[PDB]
Amino acid sequence: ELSALVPVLFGHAAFQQLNAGCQLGLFELLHERGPLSAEEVADALRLPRRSADILLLGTTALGLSTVTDGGYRNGAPIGAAFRDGLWPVLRDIVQYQDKIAYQPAADYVESLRTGQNAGIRHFPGTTRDLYSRLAAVPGLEELFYRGMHAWSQLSNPVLLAQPDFTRVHRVLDVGGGDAVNAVALARAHPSLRVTVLDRPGALEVARKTIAEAGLEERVRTHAADIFTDSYPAGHDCVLFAHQLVIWSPEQNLTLLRKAYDAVEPGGRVLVFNAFTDDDRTGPLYAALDNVYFTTLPFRHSTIHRWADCESWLREAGFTDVGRTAPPGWTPHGVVSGSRPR
Amino acid sequence: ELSALVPVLFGHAAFQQLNAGCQLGLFELLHERGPLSAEEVADALRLPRRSADILLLGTTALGLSTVTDGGYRNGAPIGAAFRDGLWPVLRDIVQYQDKIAYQPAADYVESLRTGQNAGIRHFPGTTRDLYSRLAAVPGLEELFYRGMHAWSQLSNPVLLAQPDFTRVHRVLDVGGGDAVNAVALARAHPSLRVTVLDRPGALEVARKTIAEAGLEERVRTHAADIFTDSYPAGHDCVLFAHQLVIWSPEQNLTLLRKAYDAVEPGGRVLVFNAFTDDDRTGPLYAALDNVYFTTLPFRHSTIHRWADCESWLREAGFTDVGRTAPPGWTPHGVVSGSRPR
């Protein structure tokens, strides 16, 4: 019936239950101190009993907590987040939704209409990019980067698990930025060598990320503009991590053809980012995440379908083009291809 | 796994998909014009194609719309809302969540802490009730009442379906206000007679609601304060519709004992409102609806469990105490009892 409307019609409230449990330390409480009674919870969090009962009904109905014989535990998802070392990441991301995303999401309608970021009315400035606007509010700059680091840390396992890194030798990371993915990649695969190709400005951060990891031997940098300049030869594999999502389809063909001439015959290209399902029915994560991308940043980020991306690789001349859609909950994956010999 | 986090972590966005489809007329469009292609939708709504694709992915992932061979229909829930004549009610309620509830919900945390309505910071005033604060913003007064009328219209069927109204003769509606429930009740049950017991102020609205329906014969009014004054005798059944939810448990016992002395032996008391499940695990509607009740109004509304209410009826001397929990999606029901002979 209409029951499916409930988590949507009250969706903003559903979020607030998670937001609250995070800010008031409920989930951490239930993690450290096992089963606790409503009254024990109410005490530990210094909340009016009425308030605690309400919060606990919220969190329990959502499956964020369970209640057995008067005692409250974390539910399956929150339980798992702790077990897998994800809690600080999940807490930080929820804090991001609270302080950055929540209020501007109310400008989705106007953003869809005007095709611009209508939500930026909540962050007055004269400049034309999100962080500068955010930096005008004390606290938000720091949170913005903490959030971005958290989001990345949610996805980066699926990149490292990609089987191609146990067969390629020299990887060219296009727009590799702060080398964090490059370092991680190099640690997980010791014989592998990685070149971070990016703008001079970003590479100063990259040489420090590389240095701290003491990987100055296997992880090099190469100053270039990924569009105008040409790519260094002798690379076995070309990687675009979160690159193809801000460019026009034709601009993506330019980059991929650049990957094709640069990579060695037999070589691989790997496109790693978030993908929409080909039938455009999901996945829900991507679908709901677009509200942020539609409402806040000035630059339009697009999540292309797997099939879209597969098509570009073929237009650029790659063969053995296919996809790697591994579980689980995030919509991140890899589209891949080879240059022939 | 963590998949259950998605509709919660992005819950505010999930709401925005419904909000958008309502404001831009998508669901009405898909209702009137059958299956439409993304491009046809994009055209009719005057949206950038990018915008329409995003909205449609949102709505389709949520099950609000379905897509078959390039053509979009309304999904099961939205389909049903139209079929059952509920669309204007659902549209109005969604408009309520958009303009009144959404932004203050971000003050849930502070509301739980302070036990007061922290969300009212968004509606500056010197007075101490919600509507006055809302009336200071042009448009909101009118929307507030339109919303309230819509919410009521969602629940009032479950009251009328209550079997007791085919066996009682004279009903005393305690705090019956604008007689809308009294009129409806009288129309659906022609032999029934109804007395609206309320404050003189409310009864002036009630005599007009009664008059328009030309039911001045079967629907009377009786000026009283439900706490200090006494109740008129000769009534077969005493009704509290949405009454027990703003009072302290002891204040509810006072009202119910008043119901007991006033009702005739053999008579019924009917408590009709929204109920929390006894195990406090739901229902989700009630659980998420509390964010509004915690953040905006100055008066604390409580949704008591069925068992709580059943207990009060017993403390007031009623027998044959039980509950009527009929489907479907709203948490509204009836707790009932009899005075013995």
Numbering used by the authors:
A (entry chain A), B (entry chain A): 4 to 344
Can you quote the paper on this entry?
Each ligand-bound subunit of Ss-SibL showed a similar and robust architecture in its peptide backbone, whereas a 2.1 Å r.m.s.d. in the 294 Cα positions was seen in the unbound structure, indicating a considerable conformational rearrangement upon ligand binding. Superposition of apo form and binary complex structures indicates a rotation of the C-terminal domain of approximately 22° toward the N-terminal domain36. When comparing the bound and unbound forms of Ss-SibL we observe that the peptide backbone from strand β6 to helix η5 is shifted by ~4.6 Å to constrict the active site upon substrate binding. Upon cofactor binding, the shifted Tyr134 is probably ionized and ready for catalysis. The three structures also reveal an open-to-closed conformational change induced by the cofactor, which is required for formation of the substrate-binding site. Based on these observations, a step-wise reaction of SibL can be proposed in which cofactor binding first brings the two domains close together to complete substrate-binding site formation.
It transfers a methyl group from S-adenosyl-l-methionine (SAM) to 3-hydroxykynurenine (3-HK) to produce S-adenosyl-l-homocysteine (SAH) and 3-hydroxy 4-methyl-kynurenine (3-H4MK). 3-H4MK is the key intermediate needed to synthesize pyrrolo- benzodiazepine (PBD) antitumor antibiotics, including sibiromycin and anthramycin, in Streptomycetes123.
